[PDB]
Amino acid sequence: IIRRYLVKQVVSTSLVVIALLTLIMMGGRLIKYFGFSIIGYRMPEFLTLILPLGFFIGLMLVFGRLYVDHEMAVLNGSGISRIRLGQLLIPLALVFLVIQGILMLWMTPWGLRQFDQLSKVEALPSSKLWNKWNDPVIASEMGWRVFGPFTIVIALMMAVALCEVSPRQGRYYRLIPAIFIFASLIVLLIAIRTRISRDELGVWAYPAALAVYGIAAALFSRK
Amino acid sequence: RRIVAKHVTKTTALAMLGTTIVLVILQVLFTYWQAFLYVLWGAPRYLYEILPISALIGAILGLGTLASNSELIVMRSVGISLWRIVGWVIRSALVLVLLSFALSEWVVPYTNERANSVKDPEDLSFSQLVSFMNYMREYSQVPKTYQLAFWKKVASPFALITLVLVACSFIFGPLRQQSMGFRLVIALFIGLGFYYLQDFLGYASLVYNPSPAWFVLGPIVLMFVAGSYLLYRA
Amino acid sequence: QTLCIKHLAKNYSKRWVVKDVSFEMQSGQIVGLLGPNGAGKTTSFYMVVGLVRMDKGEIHLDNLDLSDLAMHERARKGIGYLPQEASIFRKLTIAENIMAILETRKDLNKQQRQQRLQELLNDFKITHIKDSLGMSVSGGERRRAEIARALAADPKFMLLDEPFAGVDPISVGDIKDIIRNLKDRGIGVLITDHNVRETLAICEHAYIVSEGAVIAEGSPQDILENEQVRKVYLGDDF
Amino acid sequence: QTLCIKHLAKNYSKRWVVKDVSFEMQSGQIVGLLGPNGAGKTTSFYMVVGLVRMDKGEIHLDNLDLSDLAMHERARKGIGYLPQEASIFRKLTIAENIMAILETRKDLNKQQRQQRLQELLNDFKITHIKDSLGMSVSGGERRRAEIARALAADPKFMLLDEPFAGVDPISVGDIKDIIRNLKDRGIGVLITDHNVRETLAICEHAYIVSEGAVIAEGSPQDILENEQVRKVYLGDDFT
């Protein structure tokens, strides 16, 4: 009952944030493009970034709401920690990992393939990129598609760590400080995709970037 | 009344200037030895484009501190109207408007020349823009991309004051009794919403027959009317 | 002066929290607006001040209709408000808080403004903290500066919101002495409070509002011996 | 069982809010942690619950240290918390509110979880409203659902924060029966409240925390006759 309570809350507020970020992230690009089929073919490209951001923000809004209106004091006071509440959402995070794995591996290339013809390694089919790991350009793109979906898991254990907020501080107090901590992971991963494409860093740095953020989030959640 | 006016003005002015210092530092870092001077010389041009959005966040945080501390309730409890408290905040914004004029007229056109040496109609200063348009009009037809640039500059002080009044009306209206984080989040959505709306309607003025004055002064008049209505609801 | 208030009404989420609340208050008299929590004592109190817009009702102050006036337009007519929460100007000194509202007065010049400020500080015994910031004073000392600040505007009716909120039994006498001082100054006091034991000890005429309507009226002695109030609000033992 | 608290301390902004607060509460006994507002009675209460991190001292429950355990680890030892503000799960059914905590219990199976929920609803006379949402109930009925939910975790000590907060005199007696019932259930109750007059009417052992330290201890009759309390907290005239 407590797992279904959280999953229903997180899914409801993540879809609101995702639809709010899609209207903002691609409303800005649509205006720049104006300066309807193009937006349709770039849905999987932007939702590749919005989905980890929507899940992270939606996780902190739910965990912020539990703290603000004292539903966390009665959950900790009943024997259910905050770490335990984050472990109840692993089945949900696995669904979002599978969902984004579909976007990153299939629809992001397919969406970029049709857009390119209408308007590159960003749009090549994943079948043609499974092999040819020797070439750093394919190595960066294929690694971006395999280790990319695992930002959902990192968005789960890092939103649990950075959600503790006082009732008087507010539900939105820890949003801007911690969205930048999450965004620093994605900005680092985009900054890693470029380094691998120039054969300067190696494909091994994708799990290393996640592990450093994974261990840092796990240590901070257990302080 | 002077002591109350100074307290409201100084608190908002420090919030508008405090947000300005932070927003410029972040934008300098985000934009970023030869490449450091090129970004450092561009600070006045980054400063000019932050003033409309730093005044919005400054009035949200400046009045939010007053509202959350129940200081705006006891100014009304003694007979100080909402439009008087807005007028005191506008005095703080009038420093940013005067700063916008100083940057536009004497600072931006100079550091832009210095920045380009280290390494558009929008980039032209108002003194250069009006003089150039008057020169073209005397011998040829002025393009619609210069009329839009002219209207986007003459309506820059009026977009700073209107966006401040909207911020003040939100504190007294929808954003009353809300958290400081929620006010900051909403202040960021209005800032992006205004930048996108003025960008889109700027492009739409170059593709449609009506003059760019309608598209540039459109949102400013509507936000002023809508913002002044939220103040009438108290 | 009489503050006639007739047929107040207000709805929230299509539910009428206040239904026909009407009471009369006179200058130089303490009137307690009491009742069960959430039954409309707070909402009816805020509609007198002006925070909550009046859906229906008439508020008169010596045949002068204040119904349509806003919060500030009523405050200029002589209605004061003392918030329950800390409402002192944090970055202004205690003497500057009182002087801030004294400059609002039109019938005072600079010469008598300083004289009025001096006696207001002496009346509430906050002279020793007149130079300390409002954010660095005791809760008991700060509350005396908020009442002194409200009196700088020369109100005719001071509407106190939760005066005995978080007040220890040792300092409940200090608040009663303050409220009694406001009455002796010719200012009517309207008190809404959850602490009904002490609010029924200073007020001369109390109004108990339950289910959104005034269910009883009269002196505190008559309020106690009221069957409907005893059954609904005060209980059999009190 | 005897909850032992020794030498609590906590400094906020380089100011020692709590200085050497120590009290003992036994199971089945109601203890009122009172004192002047802002004198450290609220902060000392929170260090017992676990909201604010301790800065000096120790907490024992039958030679079983709880100082290093977090808030959730003490709850499994038998320590409950009831926030003063509305802490019900707003969008959960009242029957599900008690059930959400009953599923936490390891010593109950499905067969006896529904039985425990059914008797918990009947013990608090909320079985008629057991099908309504948490946010769509009366203030008096909501608090009865928060105490039934707290008992679902089966605590040995309940730390009530401001139980008589925003409570009409008609419904003060209803809470008195609830707290008396908690004592009759073998569960010790620790109460911190600003309403000292009504808190002293049910507690058999009250602690007065002034200037950050415990200055009084014993039955409410001994507290009233104490000249140190009547000088700082209760005043000359108080009953």
Side-chain angles (χ1 to χ4, degrees), chain A residues 1-119 121-220 222-223, chain B, chain C, chain D:
Chain A
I1 302 196
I2 188 60
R3 180 211 317 277
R4 176 165 41 75
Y5 180 51
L6 282 171
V7 170
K8 187 183 315 305
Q9 273 184 120
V10 167
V11 166
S12 294
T13 191
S14 169
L15 288 190
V16 163
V17 169
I18 281 158
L20 212 62
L21 290 180
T22 297
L23 193 159
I24 289 175
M25 276 207 194
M26 294 178 71
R29 269 308 290 172
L30 180 53
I31 284 161
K32 275 194 64 66
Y33 270 124
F34 186 60
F36 272 131
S37 294
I38 298 173
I39 289 302
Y41 292 138
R42 302 200 82 184
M43 211 46 49
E45 183 178 1
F46 282 86
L47 272 166
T48 289
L49 162 70
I50 287 152
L51 187 56
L53 200 60
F55 188 37
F56 177 81
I57 293 174
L59 272 192
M60 293 207 311
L61 293 186
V62 169
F63 278 65
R65 206 204 55 90
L66 302 180
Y67 270 102
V68 166
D69 62 48
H70 304 83
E71 290 165 34
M72 189 70 77
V74 300
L75 278 173
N76 300 6
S78 308
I80 312 161
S81 57
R82 174 191 47 174
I83 298 90
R84 177 69 197 158
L85 290 182
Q87 284 167 23
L88 292 188
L89 274 61
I90 284 174
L92 171 61
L94 259 53
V95 167
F96 275 179
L97 188 153
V98 168
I99 283 179
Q100 185 178 2
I102 294 176
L103 273 75
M104 291 213 86
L105 280 152
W106 170 43
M107 293 183 286
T108 291
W110 170 87
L112 267 288
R113 214 179 315 120
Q114 315 278 326
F115 165 65
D116 278 332
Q117 313 184 20
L118 191 141
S119 187
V121 75
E122 309 154 40
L124 281 164
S126 304
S127 68
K128 314 202 191 253
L129 263 56
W130 173 63
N131 211 14
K132 306 105 180 174
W133 276 93
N134 302 318
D135 203 355
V137 179
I138 294 89
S140 68
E141 163 63 27
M142 202 45 207
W144 175 268
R145 286 186 221 180
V146 165
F147 302 107
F150 291 99
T151 45
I152 282 291
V153 166
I154 305 306
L156 161 69
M157 48 179 72
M158 191 165 38
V160 165
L162 308 156
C163 68
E164 205 267 331
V165 67
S166 294
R168 54 91 171 161
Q169 281 194 7
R171 183 204 214 194
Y172 304 81
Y173 187 74
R174 274 224 194 173
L175 269 190
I176 297 89
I179 295 169
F180 279 67
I181 295 174
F182 186 63
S184 70
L185 163 65
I186 288 153
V187 169
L188 172 71
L189 285 171
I190 307 171
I192 284 186
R193 186 209 159 99
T194 306
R195 293 269 297 186
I196 305 174
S197 298
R198 303 181 209 280
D199 191 335
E200 305 178 12
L201 183 66
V203 65
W204 57 262
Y206 276 127
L210 299 182
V212 173
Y213 269 75
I215 294 168
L219 286 181
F220 191 73
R222 292 178 178 89
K223 86 193 184 312
Chain B
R1 49 201 80 180
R2 199 69 203 123
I3 283 168
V4 187
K6 293 187 286 185
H7 177 56
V8 182
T9 297
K10 153 172 210 183
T11 301
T12 307
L14 292 192
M16 290 173 169
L17 296 182
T19 315
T20 299
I21 302 311
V22 168
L23 284 191
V24 175
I25 284 181
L26 271 66
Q27 204 143 349
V28 161
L29 288 185
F30 168 77
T31 299
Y32 188 84
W33 181 245
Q34 298 289 317
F36 186 46
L37 289 192
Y38 170 73
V39 176
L40 189 64
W41 275 119
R45 194 189 31 109
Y46 309 141
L47 179 45
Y48 176 83
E49 293 179 353
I50 282 172
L51 288 187
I53 195 170
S54 80
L56 164 70
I57 304 172
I60 282 282
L61 305 186
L63 273 187
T65 302
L66 260 56
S68 72
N69 293 335
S70 187
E71 308 196 37
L72 295 176
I73 295 294
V74 295
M75 299 196 246
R76 299 201 265 152
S77 307
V78 311
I80 295 150
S81 53
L82 286 196
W83 273 104
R84 188 157 292 281
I85 294 158
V86 168
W88 292 334
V89 177
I90 295 292
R91 280 183 203 173
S92 298
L94 279 195
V95 176
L96 264 62
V97 160
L98 264 62
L99 172 70
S100 194
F101 293 171
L103 296 168
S104 168
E105 298 312 295
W106 315 313
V107 186
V108 159
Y110 170 66
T111 71
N112 273 358
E113 188 260 328
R114 287 279 97 203
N116 282 294
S117 83
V118 164
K119 200 183 173 143
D120 290 349
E122 298 292 330
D123 186 74
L124 286 167
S125 74
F126 198 75
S127 300
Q128 284 172 338
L129 189 46
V130 174
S131 67
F132 194 35
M133 293 177 70
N134 271 356
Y135 153 75
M136 294 182 286
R137 210 192 323 275
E138 278 190 29
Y139 305 112
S140 46
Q141 289 150 343
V142 57
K144 207 168 200 202
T145 180
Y146 281 84
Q147 284 165 243
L148 165 72
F150 168 78
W151 283 108
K152 200 174 284 187
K153 290 210 96 78
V154 69
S156 194
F158 297 115
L160 199 153
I161 280 169
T162 292
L163 193 60
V164 161
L165 188 152
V166 166
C168 299
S169 72
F170 268 60
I171 291 304
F172 298 117
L175 292 181
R176 182 191 20 94
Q177 274 136 23
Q178 307 288 336
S179 167
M180 206 49 63
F182 184 51
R183 284 167 174 158
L184 197 147
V185 163
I186 293 305
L188 289 172
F189 284 146
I190 306 173
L192 285 179
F194 171 73
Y195 279 165
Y196 289 170
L197 188 64
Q198 78 167 29
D199 279 350
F200 164 67
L201 293 175
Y203 301 144
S205 60
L206 308 182
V207 72
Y208 289 125
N209 273 267
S211 167
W214 294 100
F215 301 85
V216 170
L217 297 168
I220 293 158
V221 163
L222 269 70
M223 293 182 286
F224 180 79
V225 165
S228 165
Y229 180 67
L230 282 160
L231 272 164
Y232 171 71
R233 292 173 84 246
Chain C
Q1 306 209 17
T2 300
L3 183 70
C4 280
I5 299 165
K6 306 289 275 154
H7 312 286
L8 295 199
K10 175 77 181 178
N11 74 25
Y12 277 116
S13 77
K14 291 151 191 175
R15 176 187 144 252
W16 290 81
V17 293
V18 170
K19 304 184 287 288
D20 202 345
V21 163
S22 64
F23 56 95
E24 311 86 1
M25 191 216 308
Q26 291 177 343
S27 178
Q29 160 175 331
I30 309 173
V31 161
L33 181 63
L34 297 172
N37 272 89
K41 67 166 177 66
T42 317
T43 304
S44 163
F45 176 83
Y46 285 159
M47 293 178 327
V48 186
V49 193
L51 282 75
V52 166
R53 289 310 305 157
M54 211 165 48
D55 271 321
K56 279 172 39 64
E58 293 178 353
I59 296 185
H60 300 265
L61 190 152
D62 271 329
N63 65 8
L64 166 69
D65 196 14
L66 311 173
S67 309
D68 291 331
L69 306 189
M71 198 172 164
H72 59 272
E73 293 169 356
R74 297 188 210 182
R76 294 198 281 241
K77 295 291 148 203
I79 281 181
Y81 178 50
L82 188 84
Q84 169 192 351
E85 67 267 348
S87 52
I88 197 82
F89 297 149
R90 303 297 205 283
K91 299 297 188 291
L92 261 54
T93 58
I94 296 291
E96 271 181 323
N97 280 249
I98 304 161
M99 201 45 207
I101 308 307
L102 267 178
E103 307 202 75
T104 303
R105 304 272 296 285
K106 186 161 310 273
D107 62 358
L108 263 67
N109 53 54
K110 191 45 76 203
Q111 187 51 47
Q112 55 206 176
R113 276 197 207 111
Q114 299 278 13
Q115 158 184 348
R116 180 72 172 140
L117 160 71
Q118 184 62 255
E119 61 190 5
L120 268 181
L121 287 161
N122 265 357
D123 274 6
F124 296 84
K125 279 73 176 175
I126 44 171
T127 315
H128 49 94
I129 65 178
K130 76 177 168 63
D131 303 288
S132 65
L133 291 190
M135 78 185 321
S136 51
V137 285
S138 298
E141 276 158 49
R142 166 191 53 83
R143 179 52 72 101
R144 285 193 264 119
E146 303 185 12
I147 301 172
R149 172 186 60 181
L151 263 64
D154 196 50
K156 297 153 198 168
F157 302 95
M158 260 291 275
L159 321 179
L160 304 184
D161 186 14
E162 292 271 358
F164 313 98
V167 167
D168 302 324
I170 177 58
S171 61
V172 73
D174 287 17
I175 312 295
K176 290 185 180 178
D177 288 335
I178 285 172
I179 296 174
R180 270 189 263 272
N181 176 237
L182 270 69
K183 161 180 68 179
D184 293 329
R185 214 177 299 239
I187 299 167
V189 191
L190 183 80
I191 302 175
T192 176
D193 202 350
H194 162 241
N195 171 274
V196 72
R197 184 141 301 111
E198 312 287 355
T199 308
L200 281 175
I202 48 181
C203 84
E204 323 193 2
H205 188 95
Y207 294 95
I208 312 288
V209 294
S210 179
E211 282 136 30
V214 190
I215 65 164
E217 167 207 70
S219 65
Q221 179 89 313
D222 310 345
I223 293 298
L224 298 162
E225 55 185 3
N226 205 300
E227 184 206 350
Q228 201 166 0
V229 163
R230 277 257 171 93
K231 182 175 73 175
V232 165
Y233 185 41
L234 292 189
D236 290 333
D237 57 271
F238 195 79
Chain D
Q1 272 176 104
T2 311
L3 190 61
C4 199
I5 295 91
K6 292 181 181 179
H7 308 79
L8 278 185
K10 178 74 183 177
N11 57 330
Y12 272 129
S13 69
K14 296 175 181 177
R15 173 184 93 90
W16 281 98
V17 176
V18 171
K19 300 184 287 288
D20 186 75
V21 164
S22 65
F23 54 93
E24 294 88 5
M25 180 185 37
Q26 303 190 356
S27 178
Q29 179 203 47
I30 311 174
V31 168
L33 185 60
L34 311 159
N37 194 264
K41 72 161 178 63
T42 312
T43 298
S44 164
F45 176 80
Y46 286 154
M47 293 183 286
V48 175
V49 187
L51 273 297
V52 296
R53 271 303 306 155
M54 281 195 47
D55 276 345
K56 187 174 73 67
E58 57 257 14
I59 295 180
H60 299 271
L61 193 151
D62 274 335
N63 60 70
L64 183 63
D65 194 11
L66 306 169
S67 183
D68 291 326
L69 308 190
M71 181 155 168
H72 79 272
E73 274 181 272
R74 302 186 209 186
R76 305 207 305 257
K77 296 287 148 205
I79 284 180
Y81 181 48
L82 193 58
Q84 151 194 18
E85 294 94 6
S87 69
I88 195 68
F89 303 146
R90 308 303 203 281
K91 275 149 272 183
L92 267 180
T93 301
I94 280 179
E96 271 168 321
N97 288 318
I98 303 153
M99 205 49 205
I101 311 289
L102 265 176
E103 305 205 322
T104 300
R105 301 270 297 284
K106 314 262 191 293
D107 53 74
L108 286 166
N109 53 57
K110 175 43 81 203
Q111 190 59 37
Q112 46 194 21
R113 269 198 209 109
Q114 283 282 331
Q115 160 182 350
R116 179 70 174 142
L117 159 71
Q118 192 266 330
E119 72 178 1
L120 268 177
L121 287 159
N122 205 3
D123 278 7
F124 285 103
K125 329 273 189 63
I126 52 171
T127 187
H128 66 82
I129 192 166
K130 80 161 166 57
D131 279 326
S132 75
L133 290 193
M135 73 192 167
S136 68
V137 297
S138 313
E141 270 157 342
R142 182 188 45 78
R143 179 61 62 87
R144 265 189 276 125
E146 309 184 0
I147 302 161
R149 182 184 53 174
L151 294 184
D154 191 49
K156 306 155 180 182
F157 302 95
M158 191 95 58
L159 318 175
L160 300 186
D161 183 23
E162 299 269 331
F164 313 99
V167 177
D168 306 325
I170 192 66
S171 56
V172 171
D174 293 336
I175 298 177
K176 306 287 200 68
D177 314 310
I178 290 174
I179 299 179
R180 269 189 263 271
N181 175 235
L182 259 57
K183 161 185 82 176
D184 278 329
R185 213 167 296 239
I187 294 173
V189 180
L190 180 77
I191 298 167
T192 185
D193 203 318
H194 164 246
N195 194 16
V196 60
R197 185 179 270 98
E198 292 305 330
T199 305
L200 278 187
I202 43 172
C203 64
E204 311 105 340
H205 202 87
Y207 291 96
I208 304 297
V209 173
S210 173
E211 51 87 10
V214 165
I215 81 176
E217 156 171 21
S219 67
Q221 198 36 63
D222 299 347
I223 302 296
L224 292 169
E225 310 163 1
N226 200 353
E227 69 275 16
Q228 215 186 337
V229 186
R230 276 211 301 250
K231 185 178 183 293
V232 63
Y233 185 37
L234 298 182
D236 295 332
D237 44 352
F238 186 81
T239 300

